[PDB]
Design a protein around this nucleic acid. Structure first.
Length: 51
DNA sequence: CATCAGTTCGAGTCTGGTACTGCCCAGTAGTGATCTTATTTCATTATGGTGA
């Protein structure tokens, strides 16, 4: 979806500290972080072009 | 026997080590205008002694 959420939003929704997820599932968490960062970078790029 | 002391497992919490975003201000050098001042001219003004 839009602004794929970040680590903070996912952790707040799950009610767990970020280290709790981070100590067991690094690959998928890095996948979510990369997706969010890529969406932000793409949106910034379109904003730069349009501006 | 059931109490207390020595051991484990995993979660809570901080923090370093590593990368990254969305946004206008501040200083400097041009001009043109308008004063501003240490310094350079344009007249009067007083002092002077002697041959007609």
């Amino acid at each position: 979806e839009e602004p794929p959420p970040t680590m903070e939003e996912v952790g707040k929704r799950l009610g767990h500290h970020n280290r709790t997820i981070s100590r067991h599932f690094p690959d998928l968490c890095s996948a979510i972080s990369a997706k969010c960062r890529n969406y932000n970078k793409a949106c910034r790029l379109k904003s730069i072009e349009k501006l």
